[PDB]
């Protein structure tokens, strides 16, 4: 892909984070803590899952960023509407305002409804995410495999400002503590 030139500097919004997440001082890394992280509750926080939004809101243009997923067993990545539900149980789907992919139990799937099997020969250590607001496109790239395409959502109906979306996943297994990291430009 030739999307690198639309690179944007993403930072995490502490106020949206699940109360168990630990966001680095530079707001570029997030991981699951082993307990509640001693923050007050607010209507922005994802309550049920280890999720957080980027601070940046996008309503036009072309945007690109990269995320490091090294050694994780489970995660969700992509973009979502600024108005997505924060409290209770929900599925990741375009109908709910999410355009995401994930790793879970040694398989990769796109967050369609129902979910779509992805075909990845080289397990990615870094993921590229490209958003074309006007075209209604969200694309995912395997940086580890020379930028190969993973998945394209097309004909997207964003229906509002978009925010970068992250889920570090649970760590029931003891093998998923590693952070998500926003990679340098
Ligand atoms: C998702 C976080 C943590 N959590 C858990 O239920 C949990 C599960 N294993 S450890 N923490 C809260 C009840 C909700 O916020």
């Amino acid at each position: 892909h030739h999307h690198h030139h639309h690179m944007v500097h993403i930072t995490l919004d502490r106020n949206t984070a699940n109360s168990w997440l630990i966001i680095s001082k530079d707001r570029r890394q997030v991981r699951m803590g082993d307990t509640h992280q001693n923050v007050s509750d607010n209507k922005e926080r994802f309550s049920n899952y280890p999720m957080v939004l980027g601070a940046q809101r996008f309503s036009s243009g072309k945007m690109y960023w990269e995320v490091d997923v090294t050694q994780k067993e489970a995660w969700d990545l992509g973009v979502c509407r600024d108005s997505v539900q924060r409290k209770g149980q929900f599925s990741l789907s375009p109908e709910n305002g999410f355009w995401t992919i994930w790793l879970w139990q040694d398989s990769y799937e796109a967050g369609t409804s129902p979910q779509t099997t992805l075909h990845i020969q080289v397990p990615p250590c870094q993921i590229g995410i490209f958003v074309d607001y006007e075209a209604g496109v969200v694309s995912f790239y395997n940086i580890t495999d020379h930028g190969s395409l993973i998945y394209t959502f097309s004909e997207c109906v964003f229906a509002g400002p978009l925010r970068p979306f992250f889920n570090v996943g649970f760590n029931y297994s003891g093998g998923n503590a590693a952070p998500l990291k926003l990679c340098p430009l």
Side-chain angles (χ1 to χ4, degrees), residues 1-184:
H1 70 85
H2 309 282
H3 299 314
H4 306 99
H5 56 114
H6 301 298
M7 180 70 80
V8 292
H9 184 79
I10 302 305
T11 63
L12 301 170
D13 181 349
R14 310 188 156 281
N15 287 339
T16 69
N18 177 277
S19 60
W20 286 49
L21 297 184
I22 300 166
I23 292 170
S24 58
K25 176 163 54 185
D26 67 3
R27 299 188 310 111
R28 300 271 289 169
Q29 311 190 20
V30 57
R31 66 190 179 87
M32 180 61 142
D34 279 339
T35 188
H36 190 287
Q37 294 304 129
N38 205 29
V39 293
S40 63
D41 193 31
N42 73 54
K43 64 187 196 164
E44 294 178 68
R45 298 197 186 287
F46 287 101
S47 63
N48 286 46
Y49 315 103
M51 295 165 179
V52 61
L53 305 186
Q56 290 70 36
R57 285 53 154 2
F58 301 126
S59 283
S60 71
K62 297 175 181 186
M63 285 74 53
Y64 177 82
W65 62 98
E66 293 180 351
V67 185
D68 192 299
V69 300
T70 296
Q71 63 146 138
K72 294 192 63 61
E73 296 174 350
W75 50 261
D76 317 323
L77 289 170
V79 293
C80 66
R81 290 181 194 146
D82 62 349
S83 58
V84 292
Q85 168 190 347
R86 309 304 172 84
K87 313 299 186 182
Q89 297 167 75
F90 57 86
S91 47
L92 299 176
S93 64
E95 309 97 84
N96 288 341
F98 300 88
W99 296 269
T100 65
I101 71 173
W102 65 73
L103 171 61
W104 171 252
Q105 298 194 163
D106 203 33
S107 73
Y108 298 92
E109 296 170 324
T112 54
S113 188
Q115 75 259 44
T116 303
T117 298
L118 301 171
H119 299 100
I120 299 184
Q121 178 60 22
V122 175
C125 295
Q126 295 92 36
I127 301 287
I129 303 176
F130 176 65
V131 177
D132 184 338
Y133 200 99
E134 277 68 35
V137 168
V138 185
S139 289
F140 296 85
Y141 298 94
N142 184 342
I143 301 319
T144 306
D145 183 45
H146 309 285
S148 54
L149 178 68
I150 296 171
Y151 192 81
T152 290
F153 291 89
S154 71
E155 313 192 277
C156 295
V157 178
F158 296 133
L162 291 175
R163 298 185 65 182
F165 173 80
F166 308 85
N167 185 358
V168 300
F170 292 99
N171 186 26
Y172 294 107
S173 66
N176 197 40
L180 294 177
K181 310 185 188 172
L182 284 154
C183 310

